[PDB]
Write an enzyme that holds these catalytic residues in place. Structure first.
Site, PDB file in Angstrom:
ATOM      1  N   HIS A 110      30.438  14.041  47.558  1.00 34.61           N
ATOM      2  CA  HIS A 110      29.829  15.305  47.984  1.00 34.61           C
ATOM      3  C   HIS A 110      28.446  15.099  48.610  1.00 34.61           C
ATOM      4  O   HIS A 110      27.814  16.043  49.071  1.00 34.61           O
ATOM      5  CB  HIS A 110      29.816  16.375  46.866  1.00 34.61           C
ATOM      6  CG  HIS A 110      28.737  16.207  45.835  1.00 34.61           C
ATOM      7  ND1 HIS A 110      28.988  15.737  44.568  1.00 34.61           N
ATOM      8  CD2 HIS A 110      27.420  16.520  45.864  1.00 34.61           C
ATOM      9  CE1 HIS A 110      27.874  15.760  43.856  1.00 34.61           C
ATOM     10  NE2 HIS A 110      26.909  16.229  44.622  1.00 34.61           N
ATOM     11  N   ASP A 143      35.101  12.178  43.133  1.00 38.93           N
ATOM     12  CA  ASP A 143      33.778  12.274  43.750  1.00 38.93           C
ATOM     13  C   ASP A 143      33.061  10.921  43.751  1.00 38.93           C
ATOM     14  O   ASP A 143      32.141  10.683  42.967  1.00 38.93           O
ATOM     15  CB  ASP A 143      32.950  13.332  43.009  1.00 38.93           C
ATOM     16  CG  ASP A 143      31.706  13.755  43.759  1.00 38.93           C
ATOM     17  OD1 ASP A 143      31.589  13.482  44.962  1.00 38.93           O
ATOM     18  OD2 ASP A 143      30.835  14.382  43.132  1.00 38.93           O
ATOM     19  N   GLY A 151      19.853  17.043  43.141  1.00 40.76           N
ATOM     20  CA  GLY A 151      19.026  15.995  43.707  1.00 40.76           C
ATOM     21  C   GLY A 151      19.291  14.651  43.059  1.00 40.76           C
ATOM     22  O   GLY A 151      18.903  13.609  43.587  1.00 40.76           O
ATOM     23  N   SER A 204      22.377  13.924  42.197  1.00 38.32           N
ATOM     24  CA  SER A 204      23.739  13.675  42.674  1.00 38.32           C
ATOM     25  C   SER A 204      23.894  12.305  43.327  1.00 38.32           C
ATOM     26  O   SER A 204      23.052  11.893  44.119  1.00 38.32           O
ATOM     27  CB  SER A 204      24.147  14.763  43.670  1.00 38.32           C
ATOM     28  OG  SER A 204      24.243  16.030  43.040  1.00 38.32           O
ATOM     29  N   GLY A 205      24.975  11.613  42.981  1.00 38.58           N
ATOM     30  CA  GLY A 205      25.230  10.290  43.521  1.00 38.58           C
ATOM     31  C   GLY A 205      24.555   9.185  42.731  1.00 38.58           C
ATOM     32  O   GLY A 205      24.903   8.015  42.865  1.00 38.58           O
TER      33      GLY A 205
HETATM   34  N1  LIG Z   1      24.072  20.028  35.473  1.00 39.17           N
HETATM   35  C1  LIG Z   1      24.200  18.842  36.024  1.00 39.17           C
HETATM   36  N2  LIG Z   1      24.367  17.777  35.299  1.00 39.17           N
HETATM   37  C2  LIG Z   1      24.161  18.699  37.520  1.00 39.17           C
HETATM   38  C3  LIG Z   1      24.374  17.438  38.130  1.00 39.17           C
HETATM   39  C4  LIG Z   1      24.340  17.310  39.535  1.00 39.17           C
HETATM   40  C5  LIG Z   1      24.091  18.441  40.330  1.00 39.17           C
HETATM   41  C6  LIG Z   1      23.875  19.707  39.728  1.00 39.17           C
HETATM   42  C7  LIG Z   1      23.601  20.954  40.587  1.00 39.17           C
HETATM   43  C8  LIG Z   1      24.863  21.769  40.915  1.00 39.17           C
HETATM   44  N3  LIG Z   1      25.191  22.724  39.848  1.00 39.17           N
HETATM   45  S1  LIG Z   1      25.316  24.392  40.217  1.00 39.17           S
HETATM   46  O1  LIG Z   1      25.503  25.134  39.002  1.00 39.17           O
HETATM   47  O2  LIG Z   1      24.304  24.757  41.151  1.00 39.17           O
HETATM   48  C9  LIG Z   1      26.828  24.422  41.038  1.00 39.17           C
HETATM   49  C10 LIG Z   1      27.962  23.896  40.380  1.00 39.17           C
HETATM   50  C11 LIG Z   1      29.234  23.921  41.026  1.00 39.17           C
HETATM   51  C12 LIG Z   1      29.343  24.497  42.333  1.00 39.17           C
HETATM   52  C13 LIG Z   1      30.585  24.563  43.036  1.00 39.17           C
HETATM   53  C14 LIG Z   1      30.652  25.154  44.353  1.00 39.17           C
HETATM   54  C15 LIG Z   1      29.486  25.672  44.957  1.00 39.17           C
HETATM   55  C16 LIG Z   1      28.253  25.620  44.273  1.00 39.17           C
HETATM   56  C17 LIG Z   1      28.169  25.038  42.969  1.00 39.17           C
HETATM   57  C18 LIG Z   1      26.924  24.993  42.298  1.00 39.17           C
HETATM   58  C19 LIG Z   1      26.083  20.938  41.282  1.00 39.17           C
HETATM   59  O3  LIG Z   1      26.821  20.676  40.331  1.00 39.17           O
HETATM   60  N4  LIG Z   1      26.337  20.516  42.563  1.00 39.17           N
HETATM   61  C20 LIG Z   1      27.250  19.375  42.792  1.00 39.17           C
HETATM   62  C21 LIG Z   1      28.277  19.883  43.821  1.00 39.17           C
HETATM   63  C22 LIG Z   1      27.702  20.724  44.920  1.00 39.17           C
HETATM   64  C23 LIG Z   1      26.502  21.533  44.771  1.00 39.17           C
HETATM   65  C24 LIG Z   1      25.509  20.996  43.710  1.00 39.17           C
HETATM   66  C25 LIG Z   1      24.635  19.900  44.269  1.00 39.17           C
HETATM   67  O4  LIG Z   1      24.075  20.035  45.399  1.00 39.17           O
HETATM   68  O5  LIG Z   1      24.436  18.831  43.601  1.00 39.17           O
HETATM   69  C26 LIG Z   1      23.916  19.818  38.325  1.00 39.17           C
END
Ligand SMILES: N=C(N)c1cccc(C[C@H](NS(=O)(=O)c2ccc3ccccc3c2)C(=O)N2CCCC[C@@H]2C(=O)O)c1
Ligand SMILES: [Ca+2]
Length: 223
Positions: free
Chosen positions: A40, A84, A175, A177-178
């Site tokens: 992602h 992912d 942030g 992520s990855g």
């Molecule tokens: N709580 C955690 N351990 C965590 C880890 C990584 C990222 C995030 C933030 C986010 N959590 S959220 O609650 O904002 C969320 C969760 C699932 C979603 C699915 C579709 C659209 C928006 C979403 C937002 C999220 O899961 N993602 C990963 C996938 C894409 C959007 C967003 C990112 O940019 O990293 C939270």
């Protein structure tokens, strides 16, 4: 990282920052020319930054290398976030030293209860926003599949695992992520997703790397 601590400059030598004019995702160096991140995080025009601590200041241990090829997992599902994982090849090999080193792929899957080190430059607030410039670290145990599935009904697949605290207050975030989830000195996970950040009963969900070792090794060997 919410509720973590300042790692310390170059104490997590395998951590990379994916830059596209700004940091947008983390990643892990698995060898001198390959980085593993979350699918992602896929984007074109990615520059991999190694040897980073403060991402807004050139401190002297950085290696900025552009990606020559990105390979998103063949079965990645953006709607469910299943599979992912993504591999990125560097245009040139990185110079590995004490501050820039690769992390080993696991030979087996880590069990629940195992303590892991999670790191990244993501948001530090569960409600609100504040992005740090230096790397943040968090120690967190892998949760059982039952608690994980109970926390996220119908969303956990065999390629995901929960790590964190059901109480909340400590968790990865936007942030991160990855980024890497290292347990027993091996890369066991990749920061994938979660419901909010550091929310109670909503632990972080990570890509289960041990299930992808064959795919990784095969791709690296032929690309
Ligand atoms: N709580 C955690 N351990 C965590 C880890 C990584 C990222 C995030 C933030 C986010 N959590 S959220 O609650 O904002 C969320 C969760 C699932 C979603 C699915 C579709 C659209 C928006 C979403 C937002 C999220 O899961 N993602 C990963 C996938 C894409 C959007 C967003 C990112 O940019 O990293 C939270
Ligand atoms: Ca820097």
């Amino acid at each position: 990282i919410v509720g973590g601590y300042t790692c310390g400059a170059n104490t997590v030598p395998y951590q990379v920052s994916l830059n596209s004019g700004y940091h947008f995702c983390g990643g892990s160096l698995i060898n001198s020319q390959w980085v593993v991140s979350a699918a992602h995080c896929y984007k074109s025009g990615i520059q991999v930054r190694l040897g980073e601590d403060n991402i807004n200041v050139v401190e002297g241990n950085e290696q900025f290398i552009s990606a020559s090829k990105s390979i998103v997992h063949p079965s990645y599902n953006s709607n469910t976030l299943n599979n992912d994982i993504m591999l990125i090849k560097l245009k040139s090999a990185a110079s590995l030293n004490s501050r820039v080193a690769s992390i080993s792929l696991p030979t087996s899957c880590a069990s629940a209860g195992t303590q892991c080190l999670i790191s990244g430059w993501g948001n530090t607030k569960s409600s609100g926003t504040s992005y740090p410039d230096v790397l943040k670290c968090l120690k967190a145990p892998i949760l059982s599949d039952s608690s994980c599935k109970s926390a996220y009904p119908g969303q956990i697949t065999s390629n995901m695992f929960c790590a964190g605290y059901l109480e909340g207050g400590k968790d990865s975030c936007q942030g991160d992520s990855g980024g890497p989830v290292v347990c027993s000195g091996k890369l066991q996970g990749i920061v994938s997703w979660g419901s909010g950040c550091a929310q109670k009963n909503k632990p972080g969900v990570y890509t289960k790397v041990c299930n992808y070792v064959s795919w990784i090794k095969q791709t690296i060997a032929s690309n």
